[PDB]
Amino acid sequence: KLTSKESALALTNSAYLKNTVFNKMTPGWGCNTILLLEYMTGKATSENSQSNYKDFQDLLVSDRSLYIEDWWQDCYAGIANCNLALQKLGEFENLDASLVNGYMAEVKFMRALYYFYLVRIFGDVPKITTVQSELGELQVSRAPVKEIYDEIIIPDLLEAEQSDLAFSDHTGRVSMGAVKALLADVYLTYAGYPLQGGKSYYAESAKRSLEVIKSNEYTLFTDYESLRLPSQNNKGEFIYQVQFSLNKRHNESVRIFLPSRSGISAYDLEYGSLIPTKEFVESFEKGDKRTEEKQYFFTNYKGHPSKFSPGAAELEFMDLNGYYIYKFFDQVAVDNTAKSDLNWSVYRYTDVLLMYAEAQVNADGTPNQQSIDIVNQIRGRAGLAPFKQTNASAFLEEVWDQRYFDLCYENKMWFDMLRTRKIRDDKSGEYVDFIGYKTNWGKVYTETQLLFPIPLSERQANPNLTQNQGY
Ligand SMILES: [Cl-]
């Protein structure tokens, strides 16, 4: 005795459940799915021995490494939710078609989203759009990346794009802005590596990001504190986010960035699992607002009163003796409650603007005024003078620069590195080839590091899954 709308809404909502994969705690101390996408950039380390940063630092990542199981299983659980949701939504006859059309658009968006993470992380993956009971053989095989894009990701998004979905939503639901942001990213990536689909894919990308700009439904934040203010959840720049709230899931990842066993917080322990490198921090332009104390980074704080005896010096001031990420410092959570209700972004407007500039310059071979203005707005917020253009290549590298500098530690950089096969060198500021890059610790990237391994557990369950080269 659910009404038709309640039943349809529940099916639609089931598609959101495995959004936990984009930021959730995993087995280990201070282990979280977000670490997989930060540990290979060479711009983060760990003070936490249990995070398995070592495998990543040593270039000894294997089918037994952390995170990869969580990413595979939860993305595929999400996809199973979506496939069943879409089958059942199609069987509603009496309920308003417009309402059902919207709901199915949300689910198709989600299926595309899960698969887009899967293909970027693991490469070829099983191509599953049917409910499990209607599959012919459950020992599936990995299908080519190109097929996942052409048969699942792109058609899902193109159909969602032609639906009745609202353009924006401030409560956390999928919106047309989310569809356009994802589809911009899909086409931009399709044009890059591995697929190298053709320049027209840059133009298809630029169309979508431009639609988001022209909508006037999103605005740039004027400062950086908004990225760590719970009151800004689902508003301002934010297009799609993982939802954290006091009455649902708390954002435990806040503790990941805090200096290990330091006592600066209300949490029982700070993890210190994601620490920026000194070399990355020192690579920002001189006078950048982002490197000012307690903008993106911090170097001192005070000991929390629950952690030190009254009159301890630590209560007045503590030098942390290094750079730490302050970008996500939910101050109420850290100082008082130990229950962060700060959302984690999947897409925000700054990313979409830089995706427009990148696609546009790649399609047209020369920046237009909109792209020039985007780079200067992002630079202006950082207290930097406007960018003096010299050529299309220098402009593309400046867009890349602002992606590194503005979007750092937001799970974007690793994906940028894979689609360009370029890594920004901290010392010289030059974009060097991924294959041949030497890290701070003497290790050299090869073709192997372009993908993560298929988890050993999945391969032992299903020996029809091949493995990525080198693993
Ligand atoms: Cl089933």
The residue to which tokens 């006592």 are assigned: 263
Q: How many Å from the N-terminal Cα to the C-terminal Cα in the chain?
A: 51
Which helix (H) or strand (E) element contains residue 26? strand 25-26
Q: Comparing C-alpha atoms, which of 456, 358, 367, 375 is closest to residue 415?
A: 358
The answer to whether the Cα torsion of 180, 212, 229, 261 is positive or negative is positive
Which residues, at least 6 apart from 466, have a Cβ–Cβ distance to it below 8 Å?
124, 141, 142, 454
Distance of CA 46 to the CA centre of its chain: 19
Q: Are 112 and 153 in contact (CB under 8 A)?
A: yes
DSSP assignment, residue 151? I
CA distances from 457 to 72, 81, 106 (A): 10, 21, 31
- Compute the C-alpha angle 164/76/340, nearest 5°: 75
Q: What is the full DSSP assignment across 228-276?
A: G-GGGTTSTTEEEEE---TTS---GGGGGGSPTT---SSSS------EE
Tell me how far the alpha carbon of residue 85 lies from the centroid of ligand 1, in angstroms. Answer: 11
Q: Are 255 and 330 in contact (CB under 8 A)?
A: no
- Compute the C-alpha angle 244/215/166, nearest 5°: 55
Q: Are 114 and 155 in contact (CB under 8 A)?
A: no
Tell me how far the alpha carbon of residue 407 lies from the centroid of ligand 1, in angstroms. Answer: 40
* Resolution for this experimental structure (Å): 2.0
Mark 70-93 as b/e (b = at least 16 C-beta within 10 Å).
bbbebbbebbbbbbbbbebbeebe
The residue to which tokens 């972004």 are assigned: 345
Tell me how far the alpha carbon of residue 173 lies from the centroid of ligand 1, in angstroms. Answer: 26
Q: Are 182 and 122 in contact (CB under 8 A)?
A: no
Phi then psi for 389, rounded to 5 degrees?
A: -75, 145
Tell me how far the alpha carbon of residue 129 lies from the centroid of ligand 1, in angstroms. Answer: 12
Experimental method: X-ray
**What are 135's two structure tokens?**
């599959």
**What are 452's two structure tokens?**
């993560």
Which helix (H) or strand (E) element contains residue 117? helix 97-122
Tell me how far the alpha carbon of residue 432 lies from the centroid of ligand 1, in angstroms. Answer: 47
Tell me how far the alpha carbon of residue 302 lies from the centroid of ligand 1, in angstroms. Answer: 54
Which helix (H) or strand (E) element contains residue 345? strand 344-348
Tell me how far the alpha carbon of residue 128 lies from the centroid of ligand 1, in angstroms. Answer: 12
Tell me how far the alpha carbon of residue 384 lies from the centroid of ligand 1, in angstroms. Answer: 55
Q: Are 306 and 266 in contact (CB under 8 A)?
A: yes
Q: Are 437 and 448 in contact (CB under 8 A)?
A: no
CA distances from 432 to 44, 261, 355, 438 (A): 18, 36, 21, 10
Tell me how far the alpha carbon of residue 133 lies from the centroid of ligand 1, in angstroms. Answer: 4
Tell me how far the alpha carbon of residue 259 lies from the centroid of ligand 1, in angstroms. Answer: 45
Which helix (H) or strand (E) element contains residue 31? strand 31-32
Mark 112-137 as b/e (b = at least 16 C-beta within 10 Å).
bbbbbbbbbbbbbbbbbeeeeeeeee
The residue to which tokens 């920004």 are assigned: 424
Is 54 strand, coil or helix? helix
Which residues, at least 6 apart from 461, have a Cβ–Cβ distance to it below 8 Å?
none
Query: Which amino acid would we find at residue 123?
Result: G
Give all domains of the chain, ordered by start, each with its CATH number: 1-471 (1.25.40.390)
Tell me how far the alpha carbon of residue 149 lies from the centroid of ligand 1, in angstroms. Answer: 24
Tell me how far the alpha carbon of residue 132 lies from the centroid of ligand 1, in angstroms. Answer: 4
Tell me how far the alpha carbon of residue 80 lies from the centroid of ligand 1, in angstroms. Answer: 8
Tell me how far the alpha carbon of residue 82 lies from the centroid of ligand 1, in angstroms. Answer: 12
Q: Are 356 and 374 in contact (CB under 8 A)?
A: yes
Taking only Cα atoms into account, the Rg of the chain, rounded to an integer number of angstroms, comes to 22
Q: Are 131 and 87 in contact (CB under 8 A)?
A: yes
Tell me how far the alpha carbon of residue 104 lies from the centroid of ligand 1, in angstroms. Answer: 19
Tell me how far the alpha carbon of residue 178 lies from the centroid of ligand 1, in angstroms. Answer: 29
Distance of alpha carbon 267 from alpha carbon 254, whole angstroms: 10
Q: What is the full DSSP assignment across 394-441?
A: HHHHHHHHHHHHHHTTSS-HHHHHHHHTEEE-TTT--EEESTT-B-TT
The answer to whether the Cα torsion of 440, 445, 450, 454 is positive or negative is negative
Tell me how far the alpha carbon of residue 186 lies from the centroid of ligand 1, in angstroms. Answer: 29
Tell me how far the alpha carbon of residue 136 lies from the centroid of ligand 1, in angstroms. Answer: 12
Tell me how far the alpha carbon of residue 139 lies from the centroid of ligand 1, in angstroms. Answer: 15
Tell me how far the alpha carbon of residue 135 lies from the centroid of ligand 1, in angstroms. Answer: 9
- Compute the C-alpha angle 130/117/163, nearest 5°: 60
Q: Are 269 and 252 in contact (CB under 8 A)?
A: no
DSSP assignment, residue 341? -
Tell me how far the alpha carbon of residue 81 lies from the centroid of ligand 1, in angstroms. Answer: 10
Mark 327-348 as b/e (b = at least 16 C-beta within 10 Å).
bbbbbbbbbeebbbbbbbbbbb
Tell me how far the alpha carbon of residue 131 lies from the centroid of ligand 1, in angstroms. Answer: 5
Tell me how far the alpha carbon of residue 403 lies from the centroid of ligand 1, in angstroms. Answer: 42
CA distances from 13 to 68, 99, 173 (A): 25, 14, 9
**What are 122's two structure tokens?**
């693991």
Tell me how far the alpha carbon of residue 77 lies from the centroid of ligand 1, in angstroms. Answer: 12
Tell me how far the alpha carbon of residue 25 lies from the centroid of ligand 1, in angstroms. Answer: 28
Distance of alpha carbon 16 from alpha carbon 10, whole angstroms: 10
Distance of alpha carbon 385 from alpha carbon 461, whole angstroms: 56
Report long-range pairs for 215-219 (Cβ below 8 Å, ≥24 apart).
215/167, 215/168, 215/177, 217/167, 217/168, 217/177, 218/168, 218/177, 218/349, 218/352, 219/349
Distance of alpha carbon 432 from alpha carbon 420, whole angstroms: 10
Tell me how far the alpha carbon of residue 140 lies from the centroid of ligand 1, in angstroms. Answer: 15
Tell me how far the alpha carbon of residue 134 lies from the centroid of ligand 1, in angstroms. Answer: 7
Q: Comparing C-alpha atoms, which of 382, 415, 424, 168 is closest to residue 288?
A: 382
Tell me how far the alpha carbon of residue 130 lies from the centroid of ligand 1, in angstroms. Answer: 9
